[PDB]
């Protein structure tokens, strides 16, 4: 449910970044993968090799960005409660008073509705693929990384 990537430096200190990522290999195939004669006529074709070695092809990676989560906000009678749960959360509301910021503590917005507010968890420790199905990081322009891909 969470992806962790780390390493060890020269000063013997280990740093690791953790990102919430739902990992469950799903169905992915376009055939039955089965020959085919052992000996026959030789013809030119193309296939994806099984070499894991970091060469040729590459994908774009970036910060998760601020991962949106609607479960962070809760309607406390006539006010909105933002339950942090030991995470850095970026909030924004339509209502008056405090309507922006980066909170580390539990916050409450007086006289507001859940639909009039937006909250997201800020991870900046881990890397994530530049996916069109995931939103772009708000406090970031075109800052991105790249990793070599197998097959």
């Amino acid at each position: 449910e969470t992806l962790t990537v780390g390493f060890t430096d020269s000063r013997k200190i280990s740093h690791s970044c953790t990102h919430p990522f739902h990992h469950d290999p799903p169905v992915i195939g376009r055939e039955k993968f089965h020959s085919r004669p052992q000996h026959g006529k030789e013809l030119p074709c193309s296939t994806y090799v099984q070499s894991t070695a970091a060469t040729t092809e590459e994908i774009e990676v970036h910060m998760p960005p601020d991962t949106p989560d609607r479960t962070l906000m809760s309607q406390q009678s006539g006010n909105v409660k933002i339950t942090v749960n030991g995470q850095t959360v970026r909030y924004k509301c339509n209502c008056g008073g405090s309507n922006e910021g980066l909170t580390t503590t539990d916050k409450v917005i007086n006289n507001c509705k859940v639909d009039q507010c937006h909250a997201a968890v800020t991870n900046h420790k881990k890397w994530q693929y530049n996916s069109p199905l995931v939103p772009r990081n708000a406090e970031l322009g075109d800052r991105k990384g790249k990793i070599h891909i197998p097959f």
Partner: antibody, heavy 117, light 110 residues
Framework: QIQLVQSGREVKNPGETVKISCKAS????????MLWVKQAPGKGFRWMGL????????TYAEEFKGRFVFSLEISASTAYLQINNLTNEDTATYFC??????????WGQGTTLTVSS | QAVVTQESALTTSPGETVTLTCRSN?????????ANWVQEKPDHFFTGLIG???NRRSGVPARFSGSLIGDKAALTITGAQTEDEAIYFC?????????FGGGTKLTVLG
Amino acid sequence: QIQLVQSGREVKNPGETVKISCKASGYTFTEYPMLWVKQAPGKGFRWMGLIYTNTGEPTYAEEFKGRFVFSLEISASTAYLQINNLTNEDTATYFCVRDYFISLDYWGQGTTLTVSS
Amino acid sequence: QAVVTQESALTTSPGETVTLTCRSNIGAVTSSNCANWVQEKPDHFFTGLIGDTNNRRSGVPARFSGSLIGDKAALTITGAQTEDEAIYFCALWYNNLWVFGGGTKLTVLG
């Protein structure tokens, strides 16, 4: 359903310590933390802090960081307020309260302390 | 480091509609202040009415509703009753602590 019943009222001469209990009934202790409020004779209502009845971490209001110490007999659904080195101007009533629904929903009966030689 | 202000006393008659307000010294009250309304009846008897601006505690009559009116949190008693004569306190959340208002003494004919 929910009853927070508090200890009875004490008298204590300056310098002493007091442990005020709050015995909770009707809810699962663990999913709702406790607010401790001071309603001072004249002055009105004041938040003293909140205790995470799950982890056990207390928050103190800055006015209360120091002589005040929140703790809990988890096991018996009790939260407790302890005021050490009692000052004479601590006479007042202290309420325990349940934090829920983006505010406080139930208040206790109050335990009144009269600091007096 | 914020000061919640409430009307001092309000007098109404049974059957009327009365509004109590809760003002914050720092700015407009918003839904992230999670306005709470608490009632104190004689004998140091406290009950919570509304939380998170407009959530009515369970078993609190419907004549009670909360909302934000302008830049402040408000409690409206629709069809005030004789039984509603008490002190109403508002509480506002400020990112890390709660600040209580001075309370409004409400008097209802009956």
